[PDB]
Structure 1
Amino acid sequence: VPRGSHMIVKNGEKWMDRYEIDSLIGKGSFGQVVKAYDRVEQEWVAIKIIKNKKAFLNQAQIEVRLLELMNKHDTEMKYYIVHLKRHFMFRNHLCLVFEMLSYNLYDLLRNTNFRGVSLNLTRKFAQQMCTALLFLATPELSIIHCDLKPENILLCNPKRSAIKIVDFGSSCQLGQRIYQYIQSRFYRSPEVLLGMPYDLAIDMWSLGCILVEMHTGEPLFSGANEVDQMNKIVEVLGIPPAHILDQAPKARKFFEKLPDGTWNLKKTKDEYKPPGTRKLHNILGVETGGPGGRRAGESGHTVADYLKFKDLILRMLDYDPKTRIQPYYALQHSFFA
């Protein structure tokens, strides 16, 4: 019995007279992902190999149950979610066989030297992500991904705009509270930072953050820790509404209630732009040629196009999860007309 939790996988070995192991795609907390040729089906697959560790086996069983639930649906909207072909035990590890995709949206931004992709390509990603979130919001699914980020959105083909969401390992269904901290910090909603109840609206928050980053090349809210994160959110969006902070278990981690009942930022131990003064209108360069002025004298980047993009993003970054724009209504926005 091996001492380590990982599977030993040798490039070029063949599993079960079927899978020809090519190479390592990625390592993660869960285990590893290997590129393999399925000689039976004559196609590339990505095999996600789960560590022999109880916590990761449990996350992976949730992942399998949620992906299989999604597969029973007929709608074309299910094809924005990575397809689980099958799963098996091999050398005492749970192995999930996925369709093979191309590189992730972070890799795409790196290939721009972090100058961002066009507003036209951003629009195509936005429309597909809003469709994927509408699918997850189907009542019988009610799935919260809980870890949307550029690294978890993959292109199907390196020369095309089609994308899929991957990695439902941290996912849950509406009403569940499983993990103490959720979402990647730069993409983490205010309700999660505040220790408030969370629903599918946390994934729309993440999507808003992602789409700005895809066009500017830089994360909207690049916090070094939860306090720095909330402070970067407040630079752009102002102090959250009182009706939210008055109910937030962790309001006093970031804010302080003054004698008159109004909320301000908490005093530091002893630097940010004043609340609401880092305007998204200027981050996007709506009137000034887009990010860094670089989109002036290119088509598809008009002031009208930028106002529609800014307006949709600010509806996705509503502090109030009850009023934040829902996928069904985001798809009807004039940005997609």
Structure 2
Amino acid sequence: SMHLICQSGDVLSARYEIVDTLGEGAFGKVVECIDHKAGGRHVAVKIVKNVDRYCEAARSEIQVLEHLNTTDPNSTFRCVQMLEWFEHHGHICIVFELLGLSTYDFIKENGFLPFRLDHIRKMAYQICKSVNFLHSNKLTHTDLKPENILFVQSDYTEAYNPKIKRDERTLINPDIKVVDFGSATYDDEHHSTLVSTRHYRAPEVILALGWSQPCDVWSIGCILIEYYLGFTVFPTHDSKEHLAMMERILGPLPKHMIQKTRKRKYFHHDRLDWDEHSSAGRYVSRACKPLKEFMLSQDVEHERLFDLIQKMLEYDPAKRITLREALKHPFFDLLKKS
């Protein structure tokens, strides 16, 4: 269905010639096009699957982009600019400015090797600045993950290394933009039950205690530790295991969240229902240690990052640091020297 309409050489809306695939999600596909009606400018086109759910998410995304782009026409807060949208054989296609690689693709293709601290600081700052602007405008992203943070530019170099039989990519400039408003929710709109991709889901989302701007802050915390290590500290699929991993890495869950939740399946009285002395239990234990033991250095700038990471992963969303305050954290002082 989608396969039949996203081929190299295909022409969309009598101007956009597909030259390459940039990526794939559950929503569908992102393709690189030459725009023959804008002097041959390369753009990005999100082709949405002709399914009810993804169609309605795409109409929702278009509405959010019109708002964010109108409010911030210079993209000072780094949300991707939408150029226009059309229908091609029943599929909604959204045209955007072409950006470079996802942070996900860059880490994955370098063999899950982390970003440098200097790069992470700049990227964290821009991610917080961009998501804080959604926060100012009565939005929650809900689906922040490395796949949805793209480098503005192809500002990197690439060489084949025959020792390890892949390309290695070296970042020059780490500037990013935030993409995918398919899930973004206004404060007064109906809130989805489940939101976020398992690895980046806040404990208030897992426990169905209600969610808000603070669930984004949790996701950014998870992104930052993945950028620093090259992998997530929550490598799991299952909800309970995910909660076991939070206990190991971050310390016990607040009793009030455990007792308030209707998600009682996960618990037994006051505590996670988790045989730690079992095979799957000892496995989680091996994979997990207190957060600050992931630090690769005791240098103070590593202490700075992990203090912010720890405040972003506060269990209680009423307590969790805001992006307004995260922007002011000591980790960022290095960017504001003068």
TM range (shorter): 0.7 to 0.9
Instruction: Quote the offset at 1:218 in angstroms.
Output: 1.4
Instruction: Quote the offset at 1:267 in angstroms.
Output: 4.1
Q: Which runs of 5+ in 1 are unaligned?
A: 258-262, 288-302
Aligned positions of 1:135-174 closer than 5 A: 135-138=133-136, 141-159=137-155, 160-174=173-187
In 2: Cα distance, 1:180 partner to 1:5 partner? 29
Partner of 1:247: 260
Aligned positions of 1:16-165 closer than 5 A: 16-42=13-39, 43-74=41-72, 78-138=76-136, 141-159=137-155, 160-165=173-178
Q: Which amino acid aligns with 1:230?
A: L
In 2: Cα distance, 1:18 partner to 1:318 partner? 49
Moved >6 Å (runs of 4+)? none
Instruction: Quote the offset at 1:172 in angstroms.
Output: 1.3
Q: Which amino acid aligns with 1:34?
A: V
In 1: Cα distance, 2:99 partner to 2:315 partner? 34
Alignment counterpart, residue 265 of structure 1, candidates 259, 272, 286: 272
Task: Give the CA RMSD over aligned residues.
Answer: 2.1
Q: Which amino acid aligns with 2:70?
A: K
Alignment counterpart, residue 285 of structure 1, candidates 296, 300, 323: 296
Q: Which amino acid aligns with 1:22?
A: V
DSSP 3-state at the match of 1:80: coil
- For the structure 1 residues 5 and 155, does the alpha-carbon distance in structure 2 shift closer, same or farther, using more than 3 Å as the test? closer
Partner of 2:205: 192
- For the structure 1 residues 96 and 77, does the alpha-carbon distance in structure 2 shift closer, same or farther, using more than 3 Å as the test? closer
Q: Which amino acid aligns with 1:145?
A: H
DSSP 3-state at the match of 2:5: coil
In 2: Cα distance, 1:162 partner to 1:317 partner? 24
- For the structure 1 residues 219 and 267, does the alpha-carbon distance in structure 2 shift closer, same or farther, using more than 3 Å as the test? closer
In 2: Cα distance, 1:111 partner to 1:23 partner? 18
In 2: Cα distance, 1:129 partner to 1:26 partner? 21
Instruction: Quote the offset at 1:256 in angstroms.
Output: 2.7
Alpha carbons 2:75, 2:81 under 8 Å: kept: no
DSSP 3-state at the match of 2:71: coil
Q: For 1:206-233, what per-residue CA distance to the aligned partner results, in whole angstroms no more than 9, with x for missing partners?
A: 0001101101111021122111111111
Identical pairs, percent: 33
DSSP 3-state at the match of 1:20: strand
Give TM-score, length-normalised by structure 1. 0.85
DSSP 3-state at the match of 1:137: helix
Instruction: Quote the offset at 1:8 in angstroms.
Output: 1.9
Instruction: Quote the offset at 1:247 in angstroms.
Output: 1.6
Instruction: Quote the offset at 1:88 in angstroms.
Output: 1.6
In 1: Cα distance, 2:225 partner to 2:69 partner? 31
Hey, which of these two has a bigger chunk of helix by percent? 2
Alpha carbons 2:13, 2:86 under 8 Å: kept: no
Q: Which runs of 5+ in 2 are unaligned?
A: 156-172, 334-338
Alpha carbons 2:244, 2:274 under 8 Å: kept: no
Partner of 2:224: 211
Q: Which amino acid aligns with 2:234?
A: F
DSSP 3-state at the match of 2:321: coil
Partner of 2:169: none
Q: Which amino acid aligns with 1:127?
A: Y
In 2: Cα distance, 1:227 partner to 1:213 partner? 21
Partner of 1:319: 315
- For the structure 1 residues 53 and 110, does the alpha-carbon distance in structure 2 shift closer, same or farther, using more than 3 Å as the test? closer
Instruction: Quote the offset at 1:6 in angstroms.
Output: 5.9
Of residues 322-331 and 6-15 in structure 1, the stretch that sits farther from structure 2 once superposed is 6-15
Partner of 1:294: none
- For the structure 1 residues 194 and 156, does the alpha-carbon distance in structure 2 shift closer, same or farther, using more than 3 Å as the test? same
In 1: Cα distance, 2:232 partner to 2:225 partner? 7
Of residues 4-13 and 147-156 in structure 1, the stretch that sits farther from structure 2 once superposed is 4-13
Matched, 1:10 2:21: no
Alpha carbons 1:80, 1:163 under 8 Å: kept: yes
Alpha carbons 1:239, 1:265 under 8 Å: kept: no
